């Protein structure tokens, strides 16, 4: 199924995922696509900050849900 | 079609902000070459081996045709792998990442693929100079 | 050849046709998304007697994604590092598709006019710029003479 990832920045990528995919498993996919390493990834869905040990289905994240990627703000 | 300079700046970011595995590090050999031709790299020995617990310092030459053409690697720190010349330290152009090399490859993938040959797909602990022994 | 978006082509052409005062930008024959750029150091600034070289590249997803820019001429500035990299809001969070190449270059020129050590890219430079401001202005004016092409 597909889900979207928005970010305070500007990007808005789409991911091919599975209801059973864990959060960690999702952070990885975000890496391959944008190059961002997981240990710096913060994910939020519908008011909830996601935890690595849980699946997408645990969070009731179904197709077309939009996750928000929180990245530590850089300087200019 | 991304110009060499910008591809390099792209990899420079990842290298300086550490966006990569802790086993490897890469960056400019010096902040004066505006062309970013010379780069230094590092690979800490794989765990449980003669390699285990040691930092390998390498030299990466990103030529004017990088990344269309692979870069030139060379072990600074003395070491003893096969694909590397026993006297110079150059990583032979036949090494799978060097040959086969594709634009999509990066100094990151290079160092990793190079760190795999370590821990030697076997036990090949050869016997290392380790120490401050340098090529 | 691999076509070019109507957007780029129109911008490229208008940069020559209706050039930004004190600034030039033209593409590489073998890469029309790659531009050679020169910007005159603002008048009255520490970089007034020089002409600075920069290069710029338009990414595929441009204009949704901001263009890439960096200085080639070595310059002493709190917001420009040893590799010519620039830290400017328009190139990042504030990028918008409404903006264009000319706006960006204008902005980089503006940046030379009024530095900002408080949100630096080169902290060593920035520190000199806070600790001893007039002295930094002098280092910059010197570096301009040393590394920039002299304004005719």
Short mmCIF file of C-alpha atoms in Angstrom, two decimals:
data_model
loop_
_atom_site.label_atom_id
_atom_site.label_comp_id
_atom_site.label_asym_id
_atom_site.label_seq_id
_atom_site.Cartn_x
_atom_site.Cartn_y
_atom_site.Cartn_z
CA UNK A 1 0.00 0.00 0.00
CA UNK A 2 1.11 3.61 -0.31
CA UNK A 3 1.56 6.29 2.36
CA UNK A 4 2.95 9.80 2.14
CA UNK A 5 5.68 11.53 4.12
CA UNK A 6 5.59 15.29 4.54
CA UNK A 7 8.21 17.32 6.14
CA UNK A 8 8.53 20.84 7.54
CA UNK A 9 11.07 21.35 4.75
CA UNK A 10 9.23 20.99 1.43
CA UNK A 11 9.49 17.43 0.14
CA UNK A 12 6.48 15.11 0.03
CA UNK A 13 7.57 11.58 -0.87
CA UNK A 14 5.39 8.49 -1.31
CA UNK A 15 6.25 5.05 0.08
CA UNK A 16 5.34 1.49 -0.84
CA UNK A 17 4.63 -0.17 2.52
CA UNK A 18 2.87 -3.02 4.31
CA UNK A 19 0.38 -2.90 7.22
CA UNK A 20 2.82 -5.15 9.11
CA UNK A 21 5.86 -2.91 8.50
CA UNK A 22 7.33 -1.67 11.76
CA UNK A 23 8.25 1.96 12.36
CA UNK A 24 11.98 1.19 12.10
CA UNK A 25 11.22 -0.62 8.88
CA UNK A 26 9.61 2.63 7.67
CA UNK A 27 12.56 4.84 8.66
CA UNK A 28 14.78 2.66 6.48
CA UNK A 29 12.59 3.17 3.42
CA UNK A 30 12.79 6.90 4.04
CA UNK A 31 16.57 6.59 4.01
CA UNK A 32 16.85 4.83 0.65
CA UNK A 33 14.58 7.43 -0.89
CA UNK A 34 15.87 10.69 0.62
CA UNK A 35 19.21 9.58 2.05
CA UNK A 36 18.27 10.48 5.63
CA UNK A 37 19.63 8.05 8.24
CA UNK A 38 17.02 6.63 10.68
CA UNK A 39 18.69 7.62 13.98
CA UNK A 40 17.82 11.23 13.08
CA UNK A 41 14.26 10.47 11.99
CA UNK A 42 11.26 11.48 14.06
CA UNK A 43 7.88 10.29 12.74
CA UNK A 44 4.40 11.56 13.60
CA UNK A 45 0.97 10.35 12.60
CA UNK A 46 -2.31 11.99 13.53
CA UNK A 47 -1.06 13.57 16.77
CA UNK A 48 1.14 10.61 17.67
CA UNK A 49 4.95 10.41 17.67
CA UNK A 50 5.79 6.90 16.39
CA UNK A 51 7.88 4.30 18.29
CA UNK A 52 10.30 1.86 16.62
CA UNK A 53 8.91 -1.38 18.05
CA UNK A 54 5.42 -0.91 16.61
CA UNK A 55 3.85 -1.71 13.23
CA UNK A 56 1.97 0.71 11.00
CA UNK A 57 -1.20 -1.32 11.61
CA UNK A 58 -0.75 -0.82 15.37
CA UNK A 59 -1.04 2.92 14.77
CA UNK A 60 -4.04 2.44 12.47
CA UNK A 61 -2.04 3.86 9.58
CA UNK A 62 -3.82 2.70 6.41
CA UNK A 63 -3.31 3.52 2.72
CA UNK A 64 -2.81 7.19 1.85
CA UNK A 65 -2.13 8.20 5.46
CA UNK A 66 0.37 11.04 5.61
CA UNK A 67 3.31 10.79 8.03
CA UNK A 68 5.21 13.89 9.12
CA UNK A 69 9.01 13.70 9.18
CA UNK A 70 10.62 15.70 11.93
CA UNK A 71 14.25 16.61 11.24
CA UNK A 72 16.45 18.58 13.59
CA UNK A 73 16.57 22.12 12.22
CA UNK A 74 19.81 23.24 10.60
CA UNK A 75 21.47 26.66 10.47
CA UNK A 76 21.84 28.96 7.47
CA UNK B 1 23.49 15.30 -15.69
CA UNK B 2 24.35 16.77 -12.26
CA UNK B 3 27.71 18.60 -12.56
CA UNK B 4 30.74 17.00 -10.90
CA UNK B 5 31.13 19.89 -8.49
CA UNK B 6 27.58 19.64 -7.14
CA UNK B 7 27.67 15.86 -6.91
CA UNK B 8 30.81 16.29 -4.80
CA UNK B 9 29.21 19.03 -2.66
CA UNK B 10 26.30 16.64 -2.15
CA UNK B 11 28.59 13.91 -0.83
CA UNK B 12 30.56 16.48 1.19
CA UNK B 13 27.41 17.29 3.20
CA UNK B 14 26.70 13.67 4.07
CA UNK B 15 30.37 13.27 4.98
CA UNK B 16 30.54 16.32 7.24
CA UNK B 17 27.14 15.88 8.89
CA UNK B 18 27.89 12.18 9.38
CA UNK B 19 24.76 11.01 7.50
CA UNK B 20 26.18 7.54 6.99
CA UNK B 21 27.24 4.44 8.98
CA UNK B 22 29.75 4.94 11.81
CA UNK B 23 32.13 2.48 10.18
CA UNK B 24 33.17 5.02 7.55
CA UNK B 25 34.06 8.68 7.14
CA UNK B 26 35.13 10.75 4.12
CA UNK B 27 35.82 14.39 3.41
CA UNK B 28 38.23 16.84 1.78
CA UNK B 29 41.94 16.27 2.37
CA UNK B 30 42.23 20.06 2.67
CA UNK B 31 39.95 23.10 2.45
CA UNK B 32 42.02 24.89 -0.23
CA UNK B 33 41.32 22.88 -3.36
CA UNK B 34 38.18 24.57 -4.63
CA UNK B 35 37.83 21.72 -7.13
CA UNK B 36 37.51 19.20 -4.30
CA UNK B 37 39.83 16.73 -6.02
CA UNK B 38 41.58 15.21 -3.01
CA UNK B 39 39.55 13.44 -0.33
CA UNK B 40 40.51 11.48 2.78
CA UNK B 41 38.61 8.47 4.10
CA UNK B 42 38.47 6.15 7.09
CA UNK B 43 37.35 2.65 7.92
CA UNK B 44 37.56 1.29 11.42
CA UNK B 45 38.47 -2.46 11.44
CA UNK B 46 35.51 -4.84 11.43
CA UNK B 47 34.70 -6.29 14.88
CA UNK B 48 36.40 -9.57 15.91
CA UNK B 49 39.47 -9.66 13.64
CA UNK B 50 43.03 -8.33 13.35
CA UNK B 51 41.15 -5.39 11.83
CA UNK B 52 39.01 -5.16 14.96
CA UNK B 53 39.84 -1.89 16.77
CA UNK B 54 41.84 0.04 14.13
CA UNK B 55 41.28 3.11 11.93
CA UNK B 56 42.35 2.77 8.27
CA UNK B 57 43.21 6.12 6.66
CA UNK B 58 42.78 6.21 2.86
CA UNK B 59 43.24 8.66 0.00
CA UNK B 60 40.48 9.16 -2.58
CA UNK B 61 41.17 11.03 -5.79
CA UNK B 62 38.02 12.34 -7.44
CA UNK B 63 39.12 13.12 -10.98
CA UNK B 64 37.56 15.61 -13.45
CA UNK B 65 35.25 12.94 -14.76
CA UNK B 66 33.91 11.81 -11.39
CA UNK B 67 31.42 10.24 -10.79
CA UNK B 68 31.08 9.11 -14.41
CA UNK B 69 34.53 7.59 -13.89
CA UNK B 70 35.37 5.86 -10.60
CA UNK B 71 37.76 7.64 -8.24
CA UNK B 72 41.29 6.47 -7.36
CA UNK B 73 41.71 4.98 -3.89
CA UNK B 74 44.91 4.35 -1.98
CA UNK B 75 45.57 3.11 1.52
CA UNK B 76 47.60 5.59 3.51
CA UNK B 77 47.70 3.51 6.69
CA UNK B 78 49.75 0.36 6.24
CA UNK B 79 47.47 -2.64 5.81
CA UNK B 80 47.36 -5.96 4.01
CA UNK B 81 44.34 -6.71 1.82
CA UNK B 82 44.46 -8.47 -1.58
CA UNK B 83 42.96 -5.81 -3.90
CA UNK B 84 45.54 -3.35 -2.52
CA UNK B 85 49.13 -3.09 -3.75
CA UNK B 86 51.58 -4.45 -1.11
CA UNK B 87 53.88 -1.46 -1.66
CA UNK B 88 51.84 1.49 -2.98
CA UNK B 89 48.46 0.84 -1.40
CA UNK B 90 46.37 1.45 -4.48
CA UNK B 91 43.10 -0.44 -4.71
CA UNK B 92 43.25 -2.21 -8.11
CA UNK B 93 40.84 -0.99 -10.81
CA UNK B 94 39.59 -4.58 -11.15
CA UNK B 95 37.95 -4.49 -7.68
CA UNK B 96 34.23 -4.94 -8.29
CA UNK B 97 33.20 -1.47 -7.08
CA UNK B 98 35.95 0.23 -9.11
CA UNK B 99 35.32 -1.75 -12.28
CA UNK B 100 31.55 -2.01 -12.78
CA UNK B 101 31.46 1.46 -11.21
CA UNK B 102 28.35 3.42 -12.03
CA UNK B 103 27.47 7.10 -11.58
CA UNK B 104 25.13 6.02 -8.79
CA UNK B 105 28.13 4.76 -6.81
CA UNK B 106 29.63 6.99 -4.12
CA UNK B 107 32.71 7.23 -1.93
CA UNK B 108 30.38 5.92 0.77
CA UNK B 109 29.45 2.77 -1.12
CA UNK B 110 33.11 2.43 -2.08
CA UNK B 111 34.45 2.47 1.45
CA UNK B 112 31.72 0.09 2.65
CA UNK B 113 32.22 -2.39 -0.19
CA UNK B 114 35.87 -2.03 0.73
CA UNK B 115 35.22 -2.64 4.43
CA UNK B 116 33.32 -5.95 3.52
CA UNK B 117 36.45 -7.35 1.87
CA UNK B 118 37.75 -6.87 5.36
CA UNK B 119 36.69 -9.30 8.09
CA UNK B 120 37.58 -11.16 4.91
CA UNK B 121 34.69 -13.24 3.58
CA UNK B 122 36.43 -16.13 5.37
CA UNK B 123 38.85 -15.48 8.28
CA UNK B 124 41.85 -14.30 6.24
CA UNK B 125 43.39 -12.38 9.14
CA UNK B 126 46.59 -12.19 7.05
CA UNK B 127 48.57 -10.34 9.72
CA UNK B 128 48.54 -6.59 10.07
CA UNK B 129 51.19 -3.95 10.68
CA UNK B 130 48.47 -2.02 12.51
CA UNK B 131 50.34 0.60 14.53
CA UNK B 132 51.58 3.82 12.98
CA UNK B 133 52.88 1.73 10.11
CA UNK B 134 52.01 3.72 7.00
CA UNK B 135 52.36 2.99 3.28
CA UNK C 1 19.76 16.86 -26.60
CA UNK C 2 17.07 16.09 -24.00
CA UNK C 3 14.60 19.00 -23.91
CA UNK C 4 14.45 21.92 -21.48
CA UNK C 5 11.37 23.21 -19.62
CA UNK C 6 9.81 26.35 -21.06
CA UNK C 7 10.59 27.88 -17.65
CA UNK C 8 14.37 27.44 -17.79
CA UNK C 9 14.72 28.52 -21.44
CA UNK C 10 12.70 31.67 -20.81
CA UNK C 11 14.77 32.47 -17.71
CA UNK C 12 18.09 31.74 -19.43
CA UNK C 13 17.21 33.97 -22.35
CA UNK C 14 15.87 36.83 -20.19
CA UNK C 15 19.01 36.79 -18.02
CA UNK C 16 21.00 37.92 -21.05
CA UNK C 17 18.21 40.05 -22.59
CA UNK C 18 17.16 41.78 -19.36
CA UNK C 19 20.33 41.22 -17.25
CA UNK C 20 20.50 42.00 -13.54
CA UNK C 21 22.63 45.12 -13.03
CA UNK C 22 26.14 44.01 -12.04
CA UNK C 23 25.55 40.30 -12.68
CA UNK C 24 26.00 37.75 -15.46
CA UNK C 25 24.77 34.22 -15.96
CA UNK C 26 25.03 31.94 -18.97
CA UNK C 27 24.88 28.15 -19.47
CA UNK C 28 27.59 25.61 -20.25
CA UNK C 29 27.26 24.45 -23.85
CA UNK C 30 27.35 20.80 -22.70
CA UNK C 31 24.89 21.40 -19.83
CA UNK C 32 22.24 24.11 -20.14
CA UNK C 33 21.17 23.58 -16.51
CA UNK C 34 24.70 24.55 -15.42
CA UNK C 35 25.52 28.29 -15.25
CA UNK C 36 28.70 30.38 -15.04
CA UNK C 37 27.96 33.38 -12.83
CA UNK C 38 29.73 36.60 -11.93
CA UNK C 39 28.56 39.09 -9.37
CA UNK C 40 30.09 42.49 -8.78
CA UNK C 41 30.95 43.13 -5.17
CA UNK C 42 28.43 45.79 -4.02
CA UNK C 43 29.60 49.39 -4.08
CA UNK C 44 30.60 50.71 -0.62
CA UNK C 45 31.00 47.13 0.69
CA UNK C 46 34.34 45.49 1.57
CA UNK C 47 34.15 43.67 -1.76
CA UNK C 48 33.63 46.73 -3.99
CA UNK C 49 36.85 46.46 -6.05
CA UNK C 50 36.21 42.87 -7.17
CA UNK C 51 34.18 40.60 -9.46
CA UNK C 52 33.28 37.21 -7.94
CA UNK C 53 32.68 33.95 -9.78
CA UNK C 54 29.96 31.46 -8.88
CA UNK C 55 28.44 28.43 -10.50
CA UNK C 56 24.82 27.39 -10.38
CA UNK C 57 22.86 24.30 -11.35
CA UNK C 58 19.14 23.74 -11.79
CA UNK C 59 17.93 20.42 -10.40
CA UNK C 60 15.36 18.44 -12.40
CA UNK C 61 12.53 19.22 -9.96
CA UNK C 62 13.33 22.95 -10.23
CA UNK C 63 11.38 25.29 -9.67
CA UNK C 64 9.75 23.28 -6.94
CA UNK C 65 13.29 22.73 -5.64
CA UNK C 66 15.65 25.74 -5.26
CA UNK C 67 18.64 26.03 -7.60
CA UNK C 68 22.13 25.17 -6.41
CA UNK C 69 24.74 27.91 -5.99
CA UNK C 70 28.23 28.34 -4.52
CA UNK C 71 31.14 30.76 -4.94
CA UNK C 72 34.24 29.73 -6.90
CA UNK C 73 36.26 32.81 -5.88
CA UNK C 74 37.74 32.45 -2.37
CA UNK C 75 35.90 35.01 -0.22
CA UNK C 76 35.98 36.25 3.38
CA UNK C 77 32.35 36.35 4.55
CA UNK C 78 30.56 35.05 7.68
CA UNK C 79 27.94 33.33 5.55
CA UNK C 80 30.14 31.71 2.90
CA UNK C 81 32.50 28.83 3.73
CA UNK C 82 35.91 27.72 2.39
CA UNK C 83 34.28 25.85 -0.50
CA UNK C 84 32.09 28.71 -1.62
CA UNK C 85 28.96 27.32 0.01
CA UNK C 86 26.26 29.79 0.82
CA UNK C 87 23.75 29.88 3.66
CA UNK C 88 20.82 32.03 2.52
CA UNK C 89 17.14 31.63 3.38
CA UNK C 90 15.86 31.74 -0.23
CA UNK C 91 17.97 28.72 -1.16
CA UNK C 92 16.28 26.73 1.59
CA UNK C 93 13.18 27.07 3.72
CA UNK C 94 12.12 30.21 1.89
CA UNK C 95 12.46 28.77 -1.58
CA UNK C 96 9.23 29.01 -3.51
CA UNK C 97 8.41 28.36 -7.17
CA UNK C 98 7.41 32.03 -7.53
CA UNK C 99 11.10 32.88 -7.16
CA UNK C 100 13.67 32.52 -9.95
CA UNK C 101 17.34 32.56 -10.81
CA UNK C 102 17.51 36.34 -11.01
CA UNK C 103 15.92 36.70 -7.59
CA UNK C 104 18.45 34.32 -6.05
CA UNK C 105 21.49 35.99 -7.60
CA UNK C 106 20.07 39.33 -6.55
CA UNK C 107 19.81 37.91 -3.08
CA UNK C 108 23.41 36.65 -3.03
CA UNK C 109 24.54 40.13 -4.04
CA UNK C 110 22.41 41.53 -1.26
CA UNK C 111 24.10 39.08 1.15
CA UNK C 112 27.53 40.48 0.28
CA UNK C 113 26.19 43.96 0.98
CA UNK C 114 24.98 43.14 4.47
CA UNK C 115 26.68 40.20 6.29
CA UNK C 116 25.18 38.40 9.30
CA UNK C 117 27.71 36.84 11.76
CA UNK C 118 24.80 35.84 14.02
CA UNK C 119 23.68 32.96 11.79
CA UNK C 120 27.10 32.11 10.22
CA UNK C 121 28.23 29.32 7.95
CA UNK C 122 31.90 29.92 8.70
CA UNK C 123 32.19 30.39 12.43
CA UNK C 124 35.88 31.31 12.44
CA UNK C 125 35.07 34.13 10.07
CA UNK C 126 31.92 35.01 12.02
CA UNK C 127 33.86 35.23 15.29
CA UNK C 128 36.34 37.68 13.79
CA UNK C 129 33.28 39.54 12.51
CA UNK C 130 31.89 39.89 16.03
CA UNK C 131 35.13 40.20 18.02
CA UNK C 132 36.74 42.69 15.64
CA UNK C 133 34.37 43.93 12.93
CA UNK C 134 36.39 46.66 11.16
CA UNK C 135 39.41 44.32 11.10
CA UNK C 136 37.38 41.63 9.36
CA UNK C 137 36.19 44.21 6.82
CA UNK C 138 39.90 44.73 6.17
CA UNK C 139 40.65 41.00 5.78
CA UNK C 140 37.75 40.78 3.35
CA UNK C 141 38.95 43.79 1.34
CA UNK C 142 42.39 42.24 1.23
CA UNK C 143 41.16 38.76 0.20
CA UNK C 144 39.13 40.45 -2.54
CA UNK C 145 42.31 41.94 -4.01
CA UNK C 146 44.12 38.61 -3.58
CA UNK C 147 41.51 36.24 -5.03
CA UNK C 148 38.88 38.20 -6.95
CA UNK C 149 39.24 39.58 -10.45
CA UNK C 150 39.72 43.35 -10.22
CA UNK C 151 36.80 45.51 -11.37
CA UNK C 152 37.95 47.31 -14.56
#
